Amino acid sequence: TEITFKGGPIHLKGQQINEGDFAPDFTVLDNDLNQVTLADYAGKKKLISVVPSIDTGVCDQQTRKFNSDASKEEGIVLTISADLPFAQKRWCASAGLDNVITLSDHRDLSFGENYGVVMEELRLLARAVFVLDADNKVVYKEIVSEGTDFPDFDAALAAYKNI
Amino acid sequence: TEITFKGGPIHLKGQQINEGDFAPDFTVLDNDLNQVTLADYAGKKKLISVVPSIDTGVCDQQTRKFNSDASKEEGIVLTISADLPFAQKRWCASAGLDNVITLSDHRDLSFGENYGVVMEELRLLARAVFVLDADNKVVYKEIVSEGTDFPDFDAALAAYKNI
Numbered sequence: 001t002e003i004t005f006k007g008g009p010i011h012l013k014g015q016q017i018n019e020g021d022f023a024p025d026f027t028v029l030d031n032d033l034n035q036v037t038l039a040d041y042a043g044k045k046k047l048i049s050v051v052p053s054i055d056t057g058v059c060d061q062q063t064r065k066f067n068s069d070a071s072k073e074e075g076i077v078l079t080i081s082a083d084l085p086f087a088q089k090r091w092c093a094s095a096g097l098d099n100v101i102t103l104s105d106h107r108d109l110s111f112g113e114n115y116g117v118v119m120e121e122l123r124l125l126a127r128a129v130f131v132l133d134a135d136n137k138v139v140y141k142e143i144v145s146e147g148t149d150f151p152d153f154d155a156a157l158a159a160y161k162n163i
Numbered sequence: 164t165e166i167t168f169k170g171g172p173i174h175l176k177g178q179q180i181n182e183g184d185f186a187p188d189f190t191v192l193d194n195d196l197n198q199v200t201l202a203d204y205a206g207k208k209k210l211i212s213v214v215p216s217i218d219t220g221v222c223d224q225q226t227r228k229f230n231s232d233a234s235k236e237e238g239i240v241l242t243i244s245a246d247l248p249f250a251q252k253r254w255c256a257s258a259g260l261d262n263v264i265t266l267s268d269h270r271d272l273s274f275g276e277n278y279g280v281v282m283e284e285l286r287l288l289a290r291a292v293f294v295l296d297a298d299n300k301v302v303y304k305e306i307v308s309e310g311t312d313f314p315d316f317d318a319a320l321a322a323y324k325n326i
Binding site for chain 1: 215218219224245246247252253257269270271285286287325
């Protein structure tokens with residue numbers, strides 16, 4: 001439940017989700033402010049990429065890398081953050097991509113509290129990756145020890161590709 | 164106490180501030196996550212422009228117009244929203260408006276709760292304008308009754324001009 005951000009200590013708030021666990025449901029907002037839950041993606045595997053903010057460089061590169069390198073005819077790549085939906089929509093437009101799913105946890109921190117990734121001091125989500133199988137079993141998890149560092153892309157992408 | 168946003172009912176949470184009240188303190192974040200409070204603007208008159216999100220068209224236009232039409236000789240124009248600081252930063256840069264003061268209430272809703280402009284159902288700040296004299300007495304207030312409409316720019320600007 002303890003990480004660092006920019007070198008300073010950060011306490012993670014919420015339920016601890018571990019590999020082998022059943023992944024919890026949640027409620028977030030799409031870019032048009034429709035509510036979205038795990039049920040929208042039933043029957044597919046999911047790479048859930050969690051970032052502090054898509055308007056920062058590391059998070060931007062993480063979102064692009066996972067969306068470029070992971071296949072999407074086999075499953076879903078979700079980006080979840082505390083950015084407002086309006087920032088996420090603008091982000092997709094400015095990147096010139098129309099194939100990228102961004103979801104906002106800003107209103108309730110439903111996702112962050114259910115997955116244990118709320119940086120309590122900042123009201124931002126901790127940099128993390130969760131890989132869910134098509135049965136929403138958590139097959140792979142990383143919470144990045146220092147939030148300004150990149151995640152292990154290759155480990156997460158491999159877990160996702162291999163189901 | 165109650166407004167509409169897109170015609171839907173919205174309840175305003177927080178302390179009611181009226182003309183002739185003095186301005187409550189607040190704690191918000193500048194674009195580099197440093198804390199800013201009322202004391203940071205001691206000695207100046209203020210036009211405080213509150214928007215739901217600088218990444219929507221109406222809020223964009225409101226921010227541009229208040230900043231271009233108000234004199235910054237003796238006073239300052241503050242934009243406050245629940246946008247993340249990183250969206251505010253990026254917005255100012257993208258617009259060639261790096262000089263514009265944007266402040267984020269996202270973490271604590273300190274400003275929103277102390278000024279009575281939290282749209283409870285959305286966790287966004289309601290479209291609003293407060294004009295403060297150099298003594299921080301509230302000389303002019305508008306909370307826009309339907310939040311997708313523009314504020315009354317002329318009345319706020321006239322109030323600010325004549326302090």
